[PDB]
Amino acid sequence: QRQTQTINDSWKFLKGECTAAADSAFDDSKWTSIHLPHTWNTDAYTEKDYYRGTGWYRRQLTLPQGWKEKQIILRLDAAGKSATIYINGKNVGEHAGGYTACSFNITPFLSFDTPNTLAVCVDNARQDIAPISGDFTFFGGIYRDVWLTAVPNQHFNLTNHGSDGLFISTPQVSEEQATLSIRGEVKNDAPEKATLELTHTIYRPDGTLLQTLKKNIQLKAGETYAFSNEATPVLKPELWTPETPRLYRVETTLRNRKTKTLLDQSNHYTAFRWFRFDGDEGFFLNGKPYKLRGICRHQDQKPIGPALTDEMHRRDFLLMKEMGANFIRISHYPQDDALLEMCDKLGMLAWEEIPIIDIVPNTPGYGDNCERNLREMIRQHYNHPSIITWGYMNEILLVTQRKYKTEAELKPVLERTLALANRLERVLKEEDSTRISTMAFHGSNSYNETGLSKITDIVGWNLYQGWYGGDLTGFEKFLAQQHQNHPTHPMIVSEYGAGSDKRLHSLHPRAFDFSIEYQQKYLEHYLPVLEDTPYICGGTHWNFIDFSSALRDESMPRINNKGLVYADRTPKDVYHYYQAAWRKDIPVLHIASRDWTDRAGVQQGNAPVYLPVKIYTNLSEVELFIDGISLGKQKTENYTATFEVPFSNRNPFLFAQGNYQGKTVQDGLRINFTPIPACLDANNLKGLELAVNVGSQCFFTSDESQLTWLPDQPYAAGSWGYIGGKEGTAQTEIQNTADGPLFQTLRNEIEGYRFDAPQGVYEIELLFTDIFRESTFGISINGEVVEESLSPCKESGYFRALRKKYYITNDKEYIDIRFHSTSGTCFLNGIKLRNIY
Amino acid sequence: QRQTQTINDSWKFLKGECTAAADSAFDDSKWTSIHLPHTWNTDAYTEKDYYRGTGWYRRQLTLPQGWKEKQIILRLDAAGKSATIYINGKNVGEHAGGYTACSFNITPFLSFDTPNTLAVCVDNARQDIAPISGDFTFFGGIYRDVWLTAVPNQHFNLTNHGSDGLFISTPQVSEEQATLSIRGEVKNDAPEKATLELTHTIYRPDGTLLQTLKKNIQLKAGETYAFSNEATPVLKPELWTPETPRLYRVETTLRNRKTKTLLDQSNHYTAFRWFRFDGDEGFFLNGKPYKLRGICRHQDQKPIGPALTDEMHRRDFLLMKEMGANFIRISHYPQDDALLEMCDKLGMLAWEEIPIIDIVPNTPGYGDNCERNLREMIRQHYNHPSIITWGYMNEILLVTQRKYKTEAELKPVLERTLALANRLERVLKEEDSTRISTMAFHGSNSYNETGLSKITDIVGWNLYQGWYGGDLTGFEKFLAQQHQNHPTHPMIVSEYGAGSDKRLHSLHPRAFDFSIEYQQKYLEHYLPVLEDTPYICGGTHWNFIDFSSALRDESMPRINNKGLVYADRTPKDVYHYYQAAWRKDIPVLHIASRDWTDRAGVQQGNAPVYLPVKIYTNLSEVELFIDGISLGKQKTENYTATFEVPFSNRNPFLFAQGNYQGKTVQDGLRINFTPIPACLDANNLKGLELAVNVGSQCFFTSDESQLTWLPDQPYAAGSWGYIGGKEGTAQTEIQNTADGPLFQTLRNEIEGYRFDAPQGVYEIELLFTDIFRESTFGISINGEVVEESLSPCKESGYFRALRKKYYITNDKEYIDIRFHSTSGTCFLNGIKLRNIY
């Protein structure tokens, strides 16, 4: 019989090279105790320069005596980026690739009456292994399951590109009938021949038997045997869709032909579906038009990296499925079996790819490792009915076009690129003729002009109009252009998204302020275009999660914040916009304010402060209440509705309801509101901490201090605000603060800041960061100099926070701060006023 | 005149020893760029052995030309645990004590032509500085503001024990009139004699001028002049309470006698109140009985330690004040001026102490440094009218009596201890006769038998009956016996609390399961005893926050989790228990399920799963709905009501309402519910992840995977559950897992675990941690051996997680897992079951 179990436990780990670390008798007691899955790159969640290099893993293998006559296969499901396996000091094998499995028959190197030592040397510094470039962290270590499989001396091949050795397909599929094809290899590692019986048992979705195939076979000592048995056509077969994931189990059994002793067994699922892509009418599943509703998903989770356990992969999947998605771009690398098991069983169409990104370098051996990862991916994930397309390149021209400008420089790189591309297209269709090929392009017509877009069956456009420049309307314009010029290339929008940050909100959202509201604006424009345009087969949203990308700065450094859920898998409000549009079966009513629970605003006297509250819903009409008071009904358009809500009380309870298919549907939540006075006097100063996000139109709420910094406002008599200057913005990371975004916007060429305020003693905090890589200025308040010559970049350097507090005695009816430029410009990034006496 | 500003910006930091790190011509370019406040000890949030030792801070000081003729005073508000300060390489001064400020006149060391170097050597290893022991982390670094103050040559004394140099008190206070005493010192740092005018301006709470006092003073060169001025008696003074914090501003001004030019100015608050502690009748404020409704507050915040900005101290105060507290025990050390400012101005009585804890060591200079720290605390904080008592020792016999059990070992230690207490009591009464002295005891009568309880004006008892032993009712019993045996000693319950973990919930809460429910049970019992016993002055709940204590393991290692709010200052549900009991002015209606948003339970058929939902409120009657369905109106007792709630749907909306003072009050929220079947079959197995918290009556929801592990249940025909064994519990930290509490409980001597499940292919995961520091045992599943000789402690060691996954083919109608001992005992800490095929 076959025994499969993990050996994820009882490991020792050492970061860095170490000579003698493979030896049986090496002393490792001072090493770190760990448990797989593991990564040594949690540093990538704070450090841009994460450790790329070597690390050593050691674990004892003490073999069970019942395995004395079995073959022992070791499987590493992934290790980034490469691994060399030692058993008792003997090199057993090596693997190149961070996202595909590898397996080794380790029987010869094992003892059965002594301890055996397993030692894995892992390296994520190697430049001959994909990816070498791309918008994510190249995490090092053994971050998927590690298995031991013991099998009898005759068994199915388990050392074919780390796969299961068996491959099931369906050559023909129609409403009326379909045909099955069960192929694989049997291996005999006994010293003598053997006569076997092979059995293929096929079960309907409902568990009952549909058919048994039997074929007797013989193998001589040390031979591997290739079979390929068609099956009786299945009549009126139950077809698979994401919505009806009908699966047929196929159980393949290997027994000794005389004694009928069971030897080895291996189960797989199969399904019956066909599909095509149409440059004019889109995607067709089982003959019917089918809009692909997709998201892409990276595999990491802050702060553990990609060392996820399998229930986390399943949790991720439940979230994408409850949102209503029917398609997933598994990108940019092949992901855990735990995930693909769910796309088959619970139902999701799948696109899977290997990470060849940005630029084909002239690195010796790169192309060859790429082709092996393509074969590994395809052979390992071949039996997953959910997968309908493989891909191998994503934006392969992006860095190439940035780094090479002349036609002379482009020439050799475009040739390398077009070569590797056609090569892999051939490797793909040689490994699998049942699925579609695909490539993903950044938003450039040069993928057409260079020839790259004639290569695959379908094309993916990564489109960011309205985020990385352009207009939101350029998105549908870019796609209509591609469709008139290239009407036979069927298109998927394989990427679109906008960053958001829970700390930032705006009544006037713009791109690259990273407010919750701009990302919503961007997605609310993109999604109907995807749903209502026939030559768009679908879109895959980039990305389902906020994910690790150590090289990024922007509002959340080390993080790509374009997710629909946060890194911990709490959903952003906009997740429920997708749900409203994609789940018609249930009611969706979501007050879109879980991202905006700590609100502030400038208050005229005692009048209520108006701030928008948004609702995502599939109901047609919704009514919103604040502390019991109705704010009327509103008809939904585009699954959304905004109310202008009067905030007053400090802990208001928001409540929404509406009718859906005859049932009443409700939602509610409490939030926090703090009014800030527009006109300071001695009463409203008690307990006031007036804090302004100078140079920005966003409310910034610290997640460290819970303080909200108000949008900048110009000075008006009776009130407070800035005098002169223009808004300035950076996306570079700011040292020495948790509150990056507050320092990344500033009022440049500022002339003053004024507070009309009563006489007294005041605490003034000034926030500076020089983002213009020289500025020197003096600061006076009510005619007294508080800085003679402040130069933030000479004190602290560029992109580094300075917070300076001053105690100020106001003997006037105002607090007038003036800036006196002497070099460069005057700038101010934030200001906070408190009355002390 | 006077200019005060921070120099928190533009610092360089190096951890560890460094030679010549003080020299101006040192190269610190490869040091770390940091911004004060800073601690080098964020490692304490993960590591138990956090680094204790030396750290170096360097800054350039470039002085304004307008300061050329002024005295520059440098003030460090805190450095843990000691600081030595260097100006341009020359030792300026030293300070011992991590929680009090220090100040130095650095004018003689500075130049105005060339830049200056400020270097600070900070050390958190010195054993001659308190604390040497105690249940919190001794963070190193400069974690409070650092100031420069430039003053003219005649100025108020700023180098008296780091204080403001002024001392204002009210020698007599009644409702009819009060006296006011305004004292301080003036320093003439000029080489020439000076003749000055000293002005005190006293303002009513409403801002109007009440009195101007004026005296001429004359100072020789270099002289320090002590003034003591008595104001006119204040008639019908506005009395201060936490509910009415009326403050009188005292403005003290120094003028050049001839030219009338203003030289220096210092503002302070005084207030008029008197208080009294009675052994029979408790606490009296301004003649009226007053119950002290207190909390304690540590000053750290995960993961930045004590390096809080001042708006974070203000945030903490607001939450404390919104809860209804009127008393804060500022422990175990004095804290930020930003905190005491809110106590005076927004209203909260205060006890403040220095950290002499656990054992008076036999260390030279420790007594001397404790005395210096007590003088510093009283002088630096003398002018805060909220402070009504000073303390200096907390549980000073706790470690003494653990370490020494023989009278010969105890005799010297008790003499050292009584000597220091008696020393510090007279220092306190020397420094401040306007305030009560206090000492906090652990739950032992030895404080009475040693005479420690005879030293201070009042005594505090730290009491944990129902947490660290005993029954809940032993709390009121311990207090009653104290009161009858020592009726003249007035009593505060100065610590009481119980740990809790958002991940743990129990329908049968018990001590040290760390469930949210047990902490509620404990506090629901303690609070009314505090409210209703007359001879209890009040209590200070331990603690307001979950806080850093590196030596703690238990359910959240490195964290003391007895908070009313989490480390990030999100409130626990029980925070609103206090709010309902203590706020009469606002309505309080809180569904107690923000701590329990991810529910799950065992479902019989399609019958609904019943789970308690608690409500905290000061309403007399509440009505709970679930998904629009009402569940009745309940009468509240002890500010709480519990409903038995039927859960079926996945995303239920809970809604609560009642009446308060005529108006309708509401609350509501969504949570998640996952039903787990009691009887497994083909249908309900698809999508099922049956996970069990073996050997515990707690639900455990992982905050990493979001999966809930069910309380254990014994096997029953047709269902699933354990067979044999007893429950076992460890508080030691579990290596190699984020889900510690799951692995801390187990079924010891277990015999099997069984699921009545259909035939198929199942994934079983078993969880192991040996907690008994030898067990070896075998495991079989339906008679198939899966482990011949598993010894968790031999493969991994004690208190380390093992997660083993097995794939098993089940030909039967049950899955039967049996354990077969060999050495030690069999055990299981967790089990999870999925159906693959």
Ligand SMILES: [Ca+2]
């Ligand atoms: Ca896995």
Ligand SMILES: [Ca+2]
């Ligand atoms: Ca401070």
Ligand SMILES: [K+]
């Ligand atoms: K700003």
Ligand SMILES: [K+]
């Ligand atoms: K357990």
